[PDB]
Amino acid sequence: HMRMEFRHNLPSSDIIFGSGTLEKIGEETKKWGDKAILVTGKSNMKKLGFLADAIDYLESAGVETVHYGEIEPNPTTTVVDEGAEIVLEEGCDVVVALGGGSSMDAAKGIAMVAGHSAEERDISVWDFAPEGDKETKPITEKTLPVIAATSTSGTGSHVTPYAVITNPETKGKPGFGNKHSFPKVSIVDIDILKEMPPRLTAITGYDVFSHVSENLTAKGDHPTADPLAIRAIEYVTEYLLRAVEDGEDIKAREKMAVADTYAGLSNTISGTTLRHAMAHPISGYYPDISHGQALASISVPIMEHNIENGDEKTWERYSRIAVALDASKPVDNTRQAASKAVDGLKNLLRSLDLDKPLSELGVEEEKIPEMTEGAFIYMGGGIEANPVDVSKEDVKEIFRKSL
Amino acid sequence: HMRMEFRHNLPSSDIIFGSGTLEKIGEETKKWGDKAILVTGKSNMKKLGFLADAIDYLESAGVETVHYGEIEPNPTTTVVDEGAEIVLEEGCDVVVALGGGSSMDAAKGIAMVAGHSAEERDISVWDFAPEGDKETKPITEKTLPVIAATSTSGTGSHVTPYAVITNPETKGKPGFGNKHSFPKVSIVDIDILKEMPPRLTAITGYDVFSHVSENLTAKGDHPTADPLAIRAIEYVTEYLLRAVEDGEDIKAREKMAVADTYAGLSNTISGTTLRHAMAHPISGYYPDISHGQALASISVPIMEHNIENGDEKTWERYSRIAVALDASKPVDNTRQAASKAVDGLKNLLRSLDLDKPLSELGVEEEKIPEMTEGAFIYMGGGIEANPVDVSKEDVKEIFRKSL
Ligand SMILES: NC(=O)C1=CN([C@@H]2O[C@H](COP(=O)(O)OP(=O)(O)OC[C@H]3O[C@@H](n4cnc5c(N)ncnc54)[C@H](OP(=O)(O)O)[C@@H]3O)[C@@H](O)[C@H]2O)C=CC1
Ligand SMILES: NC(=O)C1=CN([C@@H]2O[C@H](COP(=O)(O)OP(=O)(O)OC[C@H]3O[C@@H](n4cnc5c(N)ncnc54)[C@H](OP(=O)(O)O)[C@@H]3O)[C@@H](O)[C@H]2O)C=CC1
Numbered sequence: 001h002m003r004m005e006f007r008h009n010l011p012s013s014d015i016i017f018g019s020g021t022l023e024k025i026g027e028e029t030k031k032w033g034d035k036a037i038l039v040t041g042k043s044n045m046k047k048l049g050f051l052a053d054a055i056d057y058l059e060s061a062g063v064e065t066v067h068y069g070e071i072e073p074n075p076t077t078t079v080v081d082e083g084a085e086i087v088l089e090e091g092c093d094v095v096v097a098l099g100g101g102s103s104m105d106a107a108k109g110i111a112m113v114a115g116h117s118a119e120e121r122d123i124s125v126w127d128f129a130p131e132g133d134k135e136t137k138p139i140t141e142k143t144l145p146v147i148a149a150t151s152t153s154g155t156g157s158h159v160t161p162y163a164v165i166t167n168p169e170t171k172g173k174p175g176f177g178n179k180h181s182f183p184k185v186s187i188v189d190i191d192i193l194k195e196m197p198p199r200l201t202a203i204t205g206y207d208v209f210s211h212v213s214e215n216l217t218a219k220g221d222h223p224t225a226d227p228l229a230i231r232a233i234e235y236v237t238e239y240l241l242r243a244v245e246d247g248e249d250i251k252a253r254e255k256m257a258v259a260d261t262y263a264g265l266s267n268t269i270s271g272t273t274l275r276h277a278m279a280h281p282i283s284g285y286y287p288d289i290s291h292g293q294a295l296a297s298i299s300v301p302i303m304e305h306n307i308e309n310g311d312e313k314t315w316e317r318y319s320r321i322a323v324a325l326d327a328s329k330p331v332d333n334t335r336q337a338a339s340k341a342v343d344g345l346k347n348l349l350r351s352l353d354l355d356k357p358l359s360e361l362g363v364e365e366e367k368i369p370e371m372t373e374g375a376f377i378y379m380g381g382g383i384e385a386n387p388v389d390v391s392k393e394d395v396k397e398i399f400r401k402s403l
Numbered sequence: 404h405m406r407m408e409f410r411h412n413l414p415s416s417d418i419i420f421g422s423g424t425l426e427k428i429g430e431e432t433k434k435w436g437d438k439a440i441l442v443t444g445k446s447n448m449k450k451l452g453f454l455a456d457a458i459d460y461l462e463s464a465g466v467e468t469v470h471y472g473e474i475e476p477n478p479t480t481t482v483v484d485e486g487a488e489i490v491l492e493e494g495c496d497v498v499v500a501l502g503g504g505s506s507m508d509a510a511k512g513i514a515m516v517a518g519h520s521a522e523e524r525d526i527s528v529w530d531f532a533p534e535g536d537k538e539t540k541p542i543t544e545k546t547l548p549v550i551a552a553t554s555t556s557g558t559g560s561h562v563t564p565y566a567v568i569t570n571p572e573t574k575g576k577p578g579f580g581n582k583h584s585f586p587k588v589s590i591v592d593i594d595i596l597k598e599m600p601p602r603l604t605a606i607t608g609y610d611v612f613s614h615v616s617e618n619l620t621a622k623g624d625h626p627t628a629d630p631l632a633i634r635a636i637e638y639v640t641e642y643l644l645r646a647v648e649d650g651e652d653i654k655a656r657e658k659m660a661v662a663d664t665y666a667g668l669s670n671t672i673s674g675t676t677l678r679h680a681m682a683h684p685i686s687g688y689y690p691d692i693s694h695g696q697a698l699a700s701i702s703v704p705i706m707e708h709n710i711e712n713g714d715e716k717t718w719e720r721y722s723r724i725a726v727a728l729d730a731s732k733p734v735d736n737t738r739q740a741a742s743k744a745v746d747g748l749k750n751l752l753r754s755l756d757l758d759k760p761l762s763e764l765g766v767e768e769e770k771i772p773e774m775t776e777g778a779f780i781y782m783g784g785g786i787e788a789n790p791v792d793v794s795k796e797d798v799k800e801i802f803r804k805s806l
């Protein structure tokens with residue numbers, strides 16, 4: 001018998017779940033600071049009115065608030081470092097996020113830079129970012145406390161330590177963070193999530209599936225995440241399409257919000273693999289490409305590569321994924337039973353209209369070697385966690401099959 | 404549609420899982436203190452040799468160690484308060500537990516008393532213990548850090564904030580604790596667990612099932628614990644009997660150790676209900692009665708009472724339990740489908756030889772009103788979490804049916 005060995009690490013988590021829980025953003029933030037910077041996108045939270053509510057709740061609680069509504073999708077080092085300057089100039093002592101993964105990651109990055117800086121600064125978020133064997137700057141408890149109110153059922157960033165920041169100079173899009181950047185309080189408000197338009201619901205919904213399906217097949221044992229990851233796939237297949245077709249289907253929104261929370265906890269305990277490692281340089285070199293669409297456009301080839309070079313333990317995991325996708329009935333540990341996850345995958349991608357080759361997104365074949373370099377330089381952890389080896393030419397071939 | 408509302412709270416968790424992970428008890432304890440008190444039972448850890456190993460690893464790591472091997476099953480206030488005096492007399496700054504729930508709870512209690520005490524003491528663990536509407540003493544970060552190495556696949560105490568301490572004067576056996584008493588590091592060593600004799604494997608195995616089955620049916624929504632609780636029941640039904648019949652079945656031991664870890668995390672997020680609330684005064688008034696056997700001897704009547712006074716949401720949960728116990732195939736939300744959990748329960752109790760009336764344990768009918776008073780005084784939280792009301796006469800009747 002092969003013995004089981006693993007180490008489970010999950011930072012303290014405090015999740016407020018329900019509709020209208022934005023109410024609490026003020027009371028909770030006060031416990032951590034008296035003056036907050038409110039990190040958000042540029043239009044939607046404002047247009048929908050939740051920006052005004054959050055500011056009200058914060059002020060009403062007694063938290064003086066500086067609004068930083070500059071976060072564009074796929075946040076950049078410049079937008080994080082410039083928000084940190086505002087934290088240092090205004091003396092903010094707590095970072096509050098209201099938005100999607102782009103807002104919550106920019107918030108964590110701002111908390112890192114501002115907490116480790118001198119008076120005027122002297123450090124950039126990129127110092128914390130992996131890059132080859134570059135000795136990163138340690139992320140310590142100096143990191144400012146973070147309050148995260150997610151507006152999308154996609155990234156699970158409200159319950160992960162990670163921030164994914166793009167460097168426009170290098171085009172790298174690495175993730176980084178630890179227990180000191182895990183949000184102190186996480187707010188999931190169904191009234192905010194239900195306003196996701198259909199396309200946004202589909203994109204972010206598939207990010208949930210991408211996290212848990214990679215967490216399950218990551219190398220090694222990780223049994224504390226597996227039940228959460230499995231349950232998330234079951235919720236995706238049962239409720240994601242319901243949420244896209246009817247944004248006001250509250251039960252479907254609640255299930256995706258729980259599934260997205262599962263993915264955050266699961267992704268903290270375990271980790272993503274080749275699919276995420278290759279989707280990052282896509283959004284890094286093509287910033288107008290959504291993270292979820294990049295994941296979808298390369299999933300089929302990647303899952304086929306891991307299955308063809310896999311073993312019975314990995315095949316058993318892909319088989320459970322297929323069952324959770326309603327693509328099969330019995331779990332088995334063969335190459336054939338694992339292949340049914342590819343059929344269930346294609347079905348999920350089709351029902352969501354996410355099955356597009358990279359060509360239809362704007363990616364060009366000339367960019368392959370650069371994106372491959374980007375995957376290994378900035379996502380080495382994901383490549384290592386993948387259940388099967390991949391050389392630099394394996395990844396180049398995968399990219400071209402996805403064109 | 405009924406909206407979903409819940410708050411998830413889980414303290415930071417650090418779990419080292421494998422065989423021979425007692426190796427790490429020294430390195431990990433050093434990160435938290437230089438002089439530890441080693442809290443253990445009186446004979447088994449010593450007889451099996453793991454006491455000598457732990458002391459070695461601790462010394463070898465540079466942690467001077469004072470051994471307190473006085474913990475008897477169902478720890479008492481006196482044994483916790485006397486261990487705290489040794490912590491204060493010797494100047495220990497970290498509490499290390501090597502044993503079952505009785506050792507790990509006594510360790511948490513020692514950490515509480517010693518951390519909040521003056522020079523000589525002036526406070527007892529009972530000050531922290533619930534007792535009617537008695538204003539308990541707040542448990543704060545003053546609590547000494549705790550390192551927990553479990554020796555049994557039963558209580559999940561290595562990943563819970565709780566300590567269950569008996570007061571011999573009152574006979575109460577309440578549980579108490581919070582984030583400040585959650586072990587900093589948790590070590591699960593298969594080489595220690597596999598030495599559990601058959602009866603101990605059966606008793607502690609059923610405590611795992613008792614936690615998760617009550618966590619699932621606790622009142623309100625708690626979806627972050629449910630997948631872990633379900634997966635634990637599946638592991639119990641598939642592997643617990645294998646572990647009892649062959650203590651050296653390593654895969655069965657690993658599954659019960661994971662299932663026991665599931666139960667700890669689940670019991671932290673959710674909570675136990677009537678079964679635990681009534682099993683405590685049993686061990687409180689009859690200290691030689693094992694916690695797990697007390698749970699088993701009252702389960703059938705309690706589960707029948709909750710099912711008869713339940714609703715469709717509660718019935719659906721008991722139905723999922725029945726499916727996980729191999730007692731049924733389809734999940735449904737009816738009284739009939741829920742009743743199949745009782746059949747699967749009786750099957751589990753029979754295969755483990757735990758189906759004994761309270762009479763065969765030594766309980767006497769004259770003790771009913773006292774045990775009922777004990778349930779409400781010291782386990783009010785569990786009664787409140789139960790999915791259906793229970794009056795004081797409901798609990799008296801339940802006790803007599805279990806005789
Ligand atoms: N663990 C982690 O840290 C993870 C991080 N990520 C990263 O996090 C980011 C996630 O991006 P994602 O969160 O998917 O979407 P983004 O947050 O990047 O942007 C979402 C877009 O949809 C709009 N929007 C957001 N919420 C709503 C709503 N409730 N109703 C209407 N419109 C809305 C926003 O408007 P506005 O412009 O006003 O915001 C924005 O234009 C990506 O960069 C991804 O790489 C991905 C997975 C995990
Ligand atoms: N979350 C919590 O805090 C929970 C707490 N509990 C409480 O925790 C306690 C749990 O008691 P439990 O842990 O079930 O058993 P105990 O730890 O109370 O005692 C176990 C008995 O078995 C022996 N033993 C323990 N491990 C081994 C082994 N590996 N090989 C051989 N013999 C062994 C011990 O010997 P020695 O005498 O040498 O130790 C002792 O006699 C109970 O008091 C229960 O009420 C229950 C559920 C949850």
Ligand SMILES: [Mn+2]
Pocket residue numbers: 155207210211276291
């Ligand atoms: Mn993602």
Ligand SMILES: [Mn+2]
Pocket residue numbers: 558610613614679694
């Ligand atoms: Mn118990």
